[PDB]
Amino acid sequence: MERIKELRDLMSQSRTREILTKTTVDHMAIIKKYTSGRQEKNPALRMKWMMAMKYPITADKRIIEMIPERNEQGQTLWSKTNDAGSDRVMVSPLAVTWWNRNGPTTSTVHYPKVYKTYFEKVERLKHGTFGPVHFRNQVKIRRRVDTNPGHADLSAKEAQDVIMEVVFPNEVGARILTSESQLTITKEKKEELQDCKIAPLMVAYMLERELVRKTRFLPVAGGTSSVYIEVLHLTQGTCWEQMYTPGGEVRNDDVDQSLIIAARNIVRRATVSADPLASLLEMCHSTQIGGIRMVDILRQNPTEEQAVDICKAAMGLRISSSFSFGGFTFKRTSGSSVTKEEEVLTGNLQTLKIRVHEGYEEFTMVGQRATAILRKATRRLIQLIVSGRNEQSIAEAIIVAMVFSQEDCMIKAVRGDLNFVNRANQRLNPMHQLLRHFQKDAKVLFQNWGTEPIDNVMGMIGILPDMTPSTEMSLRGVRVSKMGVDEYSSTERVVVSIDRFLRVRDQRGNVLLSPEEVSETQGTEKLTITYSSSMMWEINGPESVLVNTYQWIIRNWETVKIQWSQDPTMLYNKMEFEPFQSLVPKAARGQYSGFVRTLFQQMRDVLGTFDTVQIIKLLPFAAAPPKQSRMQFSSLTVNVRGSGMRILIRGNSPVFNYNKATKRLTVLGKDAGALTELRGFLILGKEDKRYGPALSINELSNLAKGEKANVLIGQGDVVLVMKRKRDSSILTDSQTATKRIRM
Amino acid sequence: MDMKRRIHLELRNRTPAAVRELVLDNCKSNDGKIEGLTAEFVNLEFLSLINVGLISVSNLPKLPKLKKLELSENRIFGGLDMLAEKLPNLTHLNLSGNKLKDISTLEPLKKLECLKSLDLFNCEVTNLNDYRESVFKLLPQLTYLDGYDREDQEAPDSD
Amino acid sequence: MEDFVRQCFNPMIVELAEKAMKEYGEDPKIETNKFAAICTHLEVCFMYSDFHFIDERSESIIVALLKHRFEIIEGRDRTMAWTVVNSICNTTGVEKPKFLPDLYDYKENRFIEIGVTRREVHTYYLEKANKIKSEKTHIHIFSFTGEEMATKADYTLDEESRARIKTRLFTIRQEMATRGLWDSFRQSERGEETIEEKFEITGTMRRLADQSLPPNFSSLENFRAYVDGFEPNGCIEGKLSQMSKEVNARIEPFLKTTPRPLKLPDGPPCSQRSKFLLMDALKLSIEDPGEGIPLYDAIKCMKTFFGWKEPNIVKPHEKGINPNYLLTWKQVLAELQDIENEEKIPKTKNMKKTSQLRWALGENMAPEKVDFEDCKDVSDLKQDEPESRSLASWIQSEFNKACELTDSSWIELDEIGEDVAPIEHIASMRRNYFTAEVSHCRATEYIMKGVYINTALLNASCAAMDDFQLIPMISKCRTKEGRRKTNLYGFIIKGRSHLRNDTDVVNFVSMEFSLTDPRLEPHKWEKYCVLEIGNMLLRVSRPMFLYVRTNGTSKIKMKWGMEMRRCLLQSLQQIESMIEAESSVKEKDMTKEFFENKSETWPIGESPKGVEEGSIGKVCRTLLAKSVFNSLYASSQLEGFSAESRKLLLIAQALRDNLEPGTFDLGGLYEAIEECLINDPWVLLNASWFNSFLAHALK
Amino acid sequence: NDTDVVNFVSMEFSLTDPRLEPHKWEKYCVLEIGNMLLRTAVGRVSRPMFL
Amino acid sequence: IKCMKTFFGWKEPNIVKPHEKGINPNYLLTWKQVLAELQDIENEEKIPKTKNMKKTSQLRWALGENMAPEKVDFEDCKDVSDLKQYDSDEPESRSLASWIQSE
């Protein structure tokens, strides 16, 4: 009631009305920065001066009614002076202690959970373990490491969407309501901070401090974790190392490796297709890693792996200029190069075609367990300085540089036939073939490289061909460095053109990440990968096939139910169940199917037997040319990696268990999803008086599936809104309209 | 949601005479007893009182047709004599996670005529020596104790 | 912008727009507003056509064998688009419009043309109607704000499908406004064409850029053309080979015979200028176990001494009214006498603004501030080389004494949490060793004296702006036995302290008891007026003198003097650095070896018998004393010296390493060092130290 | 010498919940690694598997 | 490996009872590393017959290799106030519990 009076009196004078009417809500933050005053140079001096006088600290005009003007000894706690221009009365610091002693108590249960990012530190140090101090000469490389444990791997922009939805529910914007990404954290925090009276702005700040990651490029000398870098001041020193261990909890970096696996599979199956771009984009916009759409993950994570790099590049995202070879990423600092595919002969007089990198260039060869700086000219390993832990890592870095030295000595020193194939049985890059040929043994290559004297400059142990120290004799251009070699503090993100064969060239014309140097391993992802195409399901093995089939049935439960109860024949022959029928034994697909079909019919005849879980469990066996037999099966077999798993008709089993007391279904341990045994709105126009006065984003909870109401969206404007019918997503439907024209 | 509520929530506007399987777990007990169920439940044959804080089964209803009762995760420390008379046809009992601490406590079950399984996991009585043999001698009709019959052969499925 | 274009719009529509620009020879990167406009147009067209199917009859449905109800014309090439338009026009017998409709609807057999505007839909629709009129083409115009219009108020879609595109337009507007791009995008629209950002240098700023060019050129355009058509023709090497050969570095060797002693200045001996007496300071003590009040202890200590004579002036000031100082001391004595007669230690004593005290505090000078009108008539108007003063031994004596131990524990530091970390125990051991070796040095006494006096004077200056409050000069020790002790060195009488900025000076007068006869070193005490007051028995009766002077201070100097504990920090930092280096070298902790073995010694002093070494304790004490004197005698000259002397020291040390140091101009470096040695005792003493180091190191 | 210790980490599987006798596991760090289906009296019940 | 392929109910490890005077996170990560190492053996060709685990901070701390005190000659550690005869007095008496009888 007073604020509207304030607005009226502001508008009364016709000079602030211009600012208050012509400044769109967009141009408010740029008006908020026209502050007055001169701030204050030398604030410590000003504080030491202020505390000398009385009444230093300003407080709002409420102390007057809850803090006596004098304590029980006659000392004026607060004054009445109205600092500068404001209602804030001046106050002496005695008032702070008076409040802290004779003040209104309260219950603080929301503090240990709003300020989780500090009590976590407290409880992590309280359980830390200490070890002996070792006074060895410490070597401190300059790694760029995470400095915010438990950051919840959100970016700096979706964290804002989480804050606006937990602390400011009535100011949410269009981009959130008219969406279908609720996130899980926003449902936990909304429940926890349900009655907090702390400081909405402070709650927002703490949430964005907890839900963001940061890096600092610090002189680390071990650990490198997200928790070992907060206690860097305690663990390492210029001449000491105090062995230490935080005792809290860690993050599971499994989403990143799941993303890597999904990207690898997608790129393979898109390049083996007719139009790689369409397959890549459709899969990215459709495939989901553990429920989340892969596009969100790609736009969220910073993971730098080949397959993920190609996936991002095909989606028009900036990718690091650094190229990864042999597990080490090579940041160019200077020079130019040209691929210039030329011909050479190997040690066994075998013809070979390799991109002779023509041009002098210097690289920082940063890696997981080693670092190096390598400057080389065309077929000239000019200099290579290496550092790391133990001589194994040093040898790995040296051999990687030697392989990518462009020297023909390695080519002519080959021992064997350079015919290497990968898991997919493909023709790998000849330089890469050399890399794996020499990755095991290079003794003869070391002998060919020879050894030269070193002058002992500043202290730099040389490396012998036997990978042993030597203060006088060292390999050619290889100078193992003490006191560590520092990494780099930047990645130089750039946009790189992508050819049609998954070879990520650049505007300069140097290949960064060829598609053949990606099949390092094909292990099993920890999360679940779900694809929207029936063909993709038979890629990662029987486990993925079963999980995807059941998750698809769950995804479309209402359609499956209506078709099963109305037109069962059409349902029982869909395409999505053909991959599943590949697993079921050939000699029992019929006998099984009939048993299910007949049983399903029993549900339609007698009411009250409509069991959702049973139907979802048994449905994939229906798709077959059913036969008839009196046999009453107890469990239906399935073939998984040559082993016969069993699905129980009445009960739970490893292949399928729907956990009660919850809606979650698990298949072979892999999480399937939720089965049921705010958002989603659509804008329609500006204010329309036919629908009455405007609402608030809260009241929109009371609407039907199609009712139209006009709401005050976000900070300001009112827009007519309505709930949506049909999912209305951006899946293959959008691609069809776009890819069809691309014919 | 205590029992009286969830019962109705699980009644689903369906008369008690037409329930054959009722599930009431994690809900509550008034103080330590089942309250909300009534004798009009006559068609019931599967009652699951799991995790309901339950100190005794003194005030259990009378269910002629009950065959699958389970009181796991509760804190019953005796008073099982009632189950005999009140559930004459019970044939699958699941007393796992309770506070039973003596073979004597299982004496009342000897007079159930049709008994086929008695799960007794995580109960202080299972730490005794010759535990299974003593139970199988106190309850001769039993044919599956904890899941295995007499020679540690798992009970066949489809029970 | 383009980054957002790629982010939101999928690669499909991105490539469609790419080929669309390529058809018209538009750079997808130089032009970005048009790129975004085309992407939006294509996406709205596709979303319009999509999710609609025509049955065998003429009706619309939403989603296997049925037509789309919509033919895409925009997503194709120009030639292909006109081909499709002609085909459908011939098949349906409907006149082909002169323009190119972006979509065709079969259900009404009408050419639907879509247009997305960024302003009021009214102007866009009116312009489109003016351009196209009297043809059966249906215009559908959308806006990013939710507005929407169509011909005859007819919208050929269901409400839910007209919503799924307005929603995305609104979302794009929001996401393009939170990035600061929306404002630029809006103004990029004119009529239906999307102009590109333009920044024109014309007018004065073009006549002010056709003058800011190298001498030969005469316009920015010509210079830019030259730079664009510039190819390195070896111009650098062509001038390196014709520039006069005199220009060069000409490295000159730096041999052990090269160093030359710094020429210290010549003139009258330097006189002390510190705020308070350093070594010639008497100390009236009391064994108070005290109320924490200054005047309480001041009166007690004053009464502790019996023998106060009638004050006598021993040495005048030579530029001041010595009788005023004499009567000032007498007035202070009398005022202290008054407090004895009741008032029960008023906790604060304001002096009386008498003529003597007012004069002594600088007051009444206030030279006039007239306007130039009178100045143009007077015959005397001006603003001066500061006199150069040589080095005297008294500063070296001050330092020698300040590097000595005493019978006290001058510094009492606060508490630290318990120690759990095996490194925390080592840190505590090292810190305890340092504090034990340094808690008694007279430099720590100066640290305290200075910080206490400045804190008290700051509090007095803030509290009583307009009163000549009497500020004692108290300090507090902890005698070797353990009993606390309080000490009075003198009295300070603050002046008018109406300090507005950080450089406003408050003038005060300091009176400090002493035993050193002023006539032994008459050149030290040139700024002082010294009296004789009482005789102290020690057993002989030695006269006790009072050293009165009128100094001045400001807030910045006050906070500067409140950091001699930072000076302590610097000393400990250096010692710990040395210990850590040796510990790393020997692969263990040398704290105990350094601080207990007493065999290791560093060369710190210079007696007649060559460099005289001293244990680590003396190193800590002397470094702390050096830091304290830096904090006391700070000035611009000292920093200038420190800098160039550091350069010369680094050159000398490089020579001592046989690194073959060179130099391009050493006479200039020596002149730079010598330009800052003029009239500062501390600076001249540092110069003498540097000369001795040169004589002893390089030889 | 045949008295030097060779520290080793031992990681057992089990089904016994730690919280029943927390005083017996003073020296262990007990995790929860799986969910094993066991044949109970009424059907087949899922019980946690600890390490 | 042929035994751990018999179980399909692996879940995300969770600490249900901490050591309360020890190193919990590095006990968790040693298990999460054993699982990874066993996965790597499966992917490789032929069984190595002996899997040496990667020497990482987790194993070093869990094994106690980073907790053991360092040997120092008595001359250096004379002043350290915490020196005491090893096993000076720790016969902490603990009363009988039933778990041994059940065992």
Tab-separated table of N, CA, C and O in Angstrom, chain C residues 611-656:
chain	number	residue	atom	x	y	z
C	611	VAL	N	84.741	-8.566	8.816
C	611	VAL	CA	83.332	-8.873	9.028
C	611	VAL	C	83.195	-9.759	10.251
C	611	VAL	O	83.867	-10.788	10.373
C	612	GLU	N	82.322	-9.356	11.168
C	612	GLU	CA	82.092	-10.082	12.407
C	612	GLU	C	80.771	-10.829	12.303
C	612	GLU	O	79.732	-10.223	12.027
C	613	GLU	N	80.820	-12.136	12.519
C	613	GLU	CA	79.650	-12.974	12.333
C	613	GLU	C	78.763	-12.950	13.576
C	613	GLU	O	79.149	-12.471	14.645
C	614	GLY	N	77.556	-13.472	13.418
C	614	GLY	CA	76.610	-13.544	14.517
C	614	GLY	C	75.650	-14.690	14.313
C	614	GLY	O	75.341	-15.070	13.180
C	615	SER	N	75.173	-15.246	15.423
C	615	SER	CA	74.275	-16.387	15.374
C	615	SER	C	72.945	-15.985	14.738
C	615	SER	O	72.709	-14.822	14.399
C	616	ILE	N	72.061	-16.970	14.578
C	616	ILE	CA	70.786	-16.726	13.909
C	616	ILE	C	69.947	-15.735	14.704
C	616	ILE	O	69.205	-14.927	14.130
C	617	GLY	N	70.028	-15.793	16.034
C	617	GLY	CA	69.266	-14.857	16.841
C	617	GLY	C	69.595	-13.417	16.505
C	617	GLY	O	68.702	-12.576	16.354
C	618	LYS	N	70.885	-13.115	16.372
C	618	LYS	CA	71.279	-11.761	16.013
C	618	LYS	C	70.814	-11.406	14.610
C	618	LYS	O	70.500	-10.243	14.343
C	619	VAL	N	70.753	-12.386	13.706
C	619	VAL	CA	70.241	-12.124	12.364
C	619	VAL	C	68.777	-11.712	12.433
C	619	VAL	O	68.354	-10.734	11.804
C	620	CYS	N	67.977	-12.455	13.201
C	620	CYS	CA	66.571	-12.103	13.355
C	620	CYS	C	66.429	-10.708	13.944
C	620	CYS	O	65.653	-9.883	13.448
C	621	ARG	N	67.188	-10.425	15.002
C	621	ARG	CA	67.072	-9.131	15.661
C	621	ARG	C	67.466	-7.994	14.727
C	621	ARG	O	66.786	-6.964	14.675
C	622	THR	N	68.556	-8.158	13.975
C	622	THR	CA	69.011	-7.073	13.112
C	622	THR	C	68.067	-6.865	11.938
C	622	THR	O	67.835	-5.726	11.525
C	623	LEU	N	67.509	-7.943	11.383
C	623	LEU	CA	66.532	-7.769	10.315
C	623	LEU	C	65.283	-7.066	10.829
C	623	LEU	O	64.734	-6.185	10.153
C	624	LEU	N	64.823	-7.427	12.029
C	624	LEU	CA	63.671	-6.732	12.591
C	624	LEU	C	63.980	-5.261	12.828
C	624	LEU	O	63.136	-4.396	12.576
C	625	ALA	N	65.179	-4.957	13.328
C	625	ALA	CA	65.541	-3.562	13.557
C	625	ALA	C	65.610	-2.790	12.247
C	625	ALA	O	65.190	-1.629	12.176
C	626	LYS	N	66.142	-3.416	11.197
C	626	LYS	CA	66.174	-2.770	9.891
C	626	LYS	C	64.767	-2.470	9.401
C	626	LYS	O	64.495	-1.371	8.905
C	627	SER	N	63.854	-3.433	9.538
C	627	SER	CA	62.478	-3.201	9.111
C	627	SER	C	61.828	-2.091	9.928
C	627	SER	O	61.107	-1.244	9.385
C	628	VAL	N	62.073	-2.075	11.239
C	628	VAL	CA	61.478	-1.051	12.092
C	628	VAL	C	61.986	0.328	11.700
C	628	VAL	O	61.220	1.296	11.656
C	629	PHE	N	63.284	0.447	11.423
C	629	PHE	CA	63.811	1.743	11.017
C	629	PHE	C	63.296	2.147	9.644
C	629	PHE	O	63.069	3.335	9.398
C	630	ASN	N	63.102	1.184	8.740
C	630	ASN	CA	62.420	1.494	7.488
C	630	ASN	C	61.053	2.097	7.762
C	630	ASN	O	60.662	3.091	7.138
C	631	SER	N	60.311	1.506	8.698
C	631	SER	CA	58.983	2.014	9.021
C	631	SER	C	59.040	3.377	9.697
C	631	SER	O	58.099	4.167	9.568
C	632	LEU	N	60.117	3.671	10.428
C	632	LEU	CA	60.203	4.939	11.146
C	632	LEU	C	60.654	6.070	10.233
C	632	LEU	O	60.014	7.125	10.178
C	633	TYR	N	61.757	5.872	9.511
C	633	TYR	CA	62.359	6.907	8.681
C	633	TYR	C	61.918	6.812	7.225
C	633	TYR	O	62.674	7.191	6.324
C	634	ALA	N	60.711	6.317	6.973
C	634	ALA	CA	60.259	6.135	5.602
C	634	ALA	C	60.221	7.468	4.869
C	634	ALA	O	59.904	8.508	5.452
C	635	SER	N	60.557	7.434	3.584
C	635	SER	CA	60.542	8.624	2.743
C	635	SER	C	60.786	8.192	1.304
C	635	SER	O	61.131	7.041	1.030
C	636	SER	N	60.596	9.138	0.381
C	636	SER	CA	60.785	8.841	-1.035
C	636	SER	C	62.235	8.485	-1.334
C	636	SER	O	62.513	7.580	-2.134
C	637	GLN	N	63.172	9.189	-0.700
C	637	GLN	CA	64.585	8.921	-0.935
C	637	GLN	C	64.923	7.470	-0.631
C	637	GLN	O	65.688	6.834	-1.366
C	638	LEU	N	64.376	6.932	0.459
C	638	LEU	CA	64.688	5.559	0.830
C	638	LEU	C	64.204	4.580	-0.230
C	638	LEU	O	64.914	3.630	-0.572
C	639	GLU	N	63.001	4.790	-0.764
C	639	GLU	CA	62.503	3.884	-1.792
C	639	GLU	C	63.333	3.989	-3.066
C	639	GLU	O	63.677	2.968	-3.678
C	640	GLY	N	63.675	5.212	-3.476
C	640	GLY	CA	64.512	5.363	-4.656
C	640	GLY	C	65.846	4.660	-4.500
C	640	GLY	O	66.287	3.910	-5.383
C	641	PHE	N	66.506	4.881	-3.370
C	641	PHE	CA	67.737	4.160	-3.113
C	641	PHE	C	67.454	2.677	-3.236
C	641	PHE	O	67.918	2.043	-4.181
C	642	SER	N	66.619	2.137	-2.349
C	642	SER	CA	66.316	0.712	-2.374
C	642	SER	C	66.226	0.181	-3.799
C	642	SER	O	66.838	-0.836	-4.127
C	643	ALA	N	65.538	0.904	-4.685
C	643	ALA	CA	65.346	0.410	-6.048
C	643	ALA	C	66.665	0.335	-6.823
C	643	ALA	O	67.105	-0.754	-7.234
C	644	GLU	N	67.310	1.485	-7.062
C	644	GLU	CA	68.533	1.420	-7.871
C	644	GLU	C	69.636	0.622	-7.180
C	644	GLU	O	70.408	-0.088	-7.842
C	645	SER	N	69.746	0.733	-5.860
C	645	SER	CA	70.708	-0.088	-5.143
C	645	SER	C	70.403	-1.568	-5.305
C	645	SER	O	71.327	-2.380	-5.328
C	646	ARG	N	69.130	-1.946	-5.439
C	646	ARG	CA	68.817	-3.344	-5.710
C	646	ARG	C	69.318	-3.751	-7.083
C	646	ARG	O	69.845	-4.855	-7.258
C	647	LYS	N	69.152	-2.880	-8.077
C	647	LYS	CA	69.683	-3.206	-9.401
C	647	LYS	C	71.192	-3.435	-9.336
C	647	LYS	O	71.712	-4.438	-9.849
C	648	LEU	N	71.911	-2.518	-8.685
C	648	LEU	CA	73.366	-2.648	-8.612
C	648	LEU	C	73.773	-3.872	-7.797
C	648	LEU	O	74.752	-4.550	-8.126
C	649	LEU	N	73.033	-4.167	-6.728
C	649	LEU	CA	73.310	-5.350	-5.924
C	649	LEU	C	73.127	-6.619	-6.737
C	649	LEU	O	73.906	-7.568	-6.607
C	650	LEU	N	72.082	-6.667	-7.564
C	650	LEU	CA	71.861	-7.836	-8.403
C	650	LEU	C	72.988	-8.003	-9.411
C	650	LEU	O	73.450	-9.123	-9.656
C	651	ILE	N	73.453	-6.900	-10.002
C	651	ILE	CA	74.595	-6.994	-10.912
C	651	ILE	C	75.814	-7.541	-10.178
C	651	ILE	O	76.517	-8.433	-10.674
C	652	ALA	N	76.087	-7.014	-8.983
C	652	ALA	CA	77.254	-7.461	-8.227
C	652	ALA	C	77.152	-8.943	-7.887
C	652	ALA	O	78.122	-9.695	-8.031
C	653	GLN	N	75.981	-9.382	-7.430
C	653	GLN	CA	75.809	-10.788	-7.091
C	653	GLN	C	75.947	-11.673	-8.318
C	653	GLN	O	76.496	-12.776	-8.228
C	654	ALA	N	75.451	-11.216	-9.470
C	654	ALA	CA	75.659	-11.968	-10.700
C	654	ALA	C	77.143	-12.111	-10.992
C	654	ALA	O	77.603	-13.181	-11.405
C	655	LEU	N	77.912	-11.042	-10.780
C	655	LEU	CA	79.359	-11.152	-10.933
C	655	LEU	C	79.927	-12.195	-9.982
C	655	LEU	O	80.781	-13.001	-10.368
C	656	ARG	N	79.460	-12.202	-8.732
C	656	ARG	CA	79.974	-13.153	-7.756
C	656	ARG	C	79.670	-14.595	-8.137
C	656	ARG	O	80.284	-15.511	-7.580
